[PDB]
From Swiss-Prot:
Phosphorylated. Phosphorylation by kinase PKC or casein kinase CK2 results in enhanced redox activity that stimulates binding of the FOS/JUN AP-1 complex to its cognate binding site. AP-endodeoxyribonuclease activity is not affected by CK2-mediated phosphorylation. Phosphorylation of Thr-196 by CDK5 reduces AP-endodeoxyribonuclease activity resulting in accumulation of DNA damage and contributing to neuronal death. It comes from Homo sapiens (Human). The gene is APEX1. A motif (Nuclear export signal (NES)) lies at residues 27-43. Monomer. Homodimer; disulfide-linked. Component of the SET complex, composed of at least APEX1, SET, ANP32A, HMGB2, NME1 and TREX1. Associates with the dimer XRCC5/XRCC6 in a DNA-dependent manner. Interacts with SIRT1; the interaction is increased in the context of genotoxic stress. Interacts with HDAC1, HDAC2 and HDAC3; the interactions are not dependent on the APEX1 acetylation status. Interacts with XRCC1; the interaction is induced by SIRT1 and increased with the APEX1 acetylated form. This is DNA repair nuclease/redox regulator APEX1.
Length: 281
């Protein structure tokens, strides 16, 4: 009610690193709010236009066994891996589609308690490991906040492990706006899923512990009104009343390779927009 439109125009794509090296890897990440729904909403059209080397998808709501045939229309992303809840139903779920086959693909974070909801894919490549995640939402009334805190600890420790062996890129819907600058209405959301002190603290712990850097915030430290999610309700997207819930987090050692971290504000298909990373590896 108290917010009108706040302008945001994502800057042009910077496709060369600070050292002049052209980007060699383009990763796109997107919470699609259901693979089938997203496809009907022309989601694949943007993907073909963006032409990433790797596409990471969250909330596919679909198992490896029940994918839409339409996914075959992505010839440039022929290596496709999917995680879904082990109960076999249509919620959560993540996907990773890649131009080249990873050295290894794994699912989950090595912890039975946290591996039943199809939330994580790990794709190891030559010079780095990519993790895509759909982090547990704290829930209406914060009924799942206790579990989210358990997830946060387990996930941090897991990622700390991976990074100790290879440079890490983490992307996806992390279900938290880190700082006040990461959402339009910080004041009235401090007791809502996505902006509780607990969740924000967990994110801070993640950055320090692994450690990881927030690619977007690193490049644009003072830039407000840059969001990746808007509730479907209340003309929230038209007014740019949103949250930045989608990230690329990078091992510090990968910062010199960082060209840009983009937010594709205008791409439709879901209640989130795509984000895109350019790396010079």
């Amino acid at each position: 009610a108290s917010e009108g439109p706040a302008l945001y125009e994502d800057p042009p794509d910077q496709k060369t690193s600070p050292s002049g090296k052209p980007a060699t890897l383009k990763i796109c990440s997107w919470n699609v709010d259901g693979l089938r729904a997203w496809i009907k909403k022309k989601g694949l059209d943007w993907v073909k236009e963006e032409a990433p080397d790797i596409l990471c998808l969250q909330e596919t709501k679909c198992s490896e066994n029940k994918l839409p045939a339409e996914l075959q229309e992505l010839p440039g992303l022929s290596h496709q891996y999917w995680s879904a809840p082990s109960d076999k139903e249509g919620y959560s779920g993540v996907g990773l589609l890649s131009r080249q086959a990873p050295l290894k693909v794994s699912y989950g974070i090595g912890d039975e308690e946290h591996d039943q909801e199809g939330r994580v894919i790990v794709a190891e490549f030559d010079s780095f490991v990519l993790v895509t995640a759909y982090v547990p939402n704290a829930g209406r009334g914060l009924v799942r906040l206790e579990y989210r805190q358990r997830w946060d600890e387990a996930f941090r420790k897991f990622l700390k492990g991976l990074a100790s062996r290879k440079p890490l890129v983490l992307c996806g819907d992390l279900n938290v706006a880190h700082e006040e600058i990461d959402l339009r209405n910080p004041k009235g959301n401090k007791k809502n899923a996505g902006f509780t002190p607990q969740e924000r603290q967990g994110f801070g712990e993640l950055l320090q512990a692994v450690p990881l850097a927030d690619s977007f915030r690193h490049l644009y430290p003072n830039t407000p009104y840059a969001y990746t999610f808007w509730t479907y309700m209340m003309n929230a997207r038209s007014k740019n009343v949103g949250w930045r819930l989608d990230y690329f987090l990078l091992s510090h050692s990968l910062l010199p390779a960082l060209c840009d971290s983009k937010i594709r504000s205008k791409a439709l298909g879901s209640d989130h927009c795509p984000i895109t990373l350019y790396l010079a590896l």
